[PDB]
Amino acid sequence: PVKLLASGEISRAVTVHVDAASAAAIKAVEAAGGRVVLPE
RNA sequence: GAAAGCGAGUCCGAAUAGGGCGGCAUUAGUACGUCGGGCUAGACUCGAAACCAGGUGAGCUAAGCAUGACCAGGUUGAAA
């Protein structure tokens, strides 16, 4: 499974479909506008 | 990090001393070839005494069984 981690920020509206993501990575994808999609 | 897991952070711990990690000023890997060296094979070549398996031998010799052969000549003089 896939994982999104907070490494390189530049800010952009993006929608990510990772199996799980780190607190900070969500608070960076949304913080620049966007969504982090995870299943049930 | 023992691991759940968490993640440029993570583990001890009830928070603050520290381990390993990223940033580090940071350079990058991968496929193949020739070469050094490693490991695993008999592993640089030649040599044991010995250990185990299967089988060959009693035409030698050690014995047993069966059936044959053999012992000039002389001395002594037991029982009955």
Swiss-Prot record:
Part of the 50S ribosomal subunit. Contacts proteins L4, L21 and L35. Keywords: Ribonucleoprotein, Ribosomal protein, RNA-binding, rRNA-binding. Belongs to the universal ribosomal protein uL15 family. Binds to the 23S rRNA. It comes from the Bacteria. One of its GO terms (molecular function) is structural constituent of ribosome. This is Large ribosomal subunit protein uL15. It comes from Deinococcus radiodurans (strain ATCC 13939 / DSM 20539 / JCM 16871 / CCUG 27074 / LMG 4051 / NBRC 15346 / NCIMB 9279 / VKM B-1422 / R1). GO terms for cellular component: cytosolic large ribosomal subunit. The keyword Ribosomal protein applies. GO terms for biological process: translation. The chain holds residues 105 to 144 of 156 of the full protein. The gene is rplO. The keyword Nucleus does not apply.
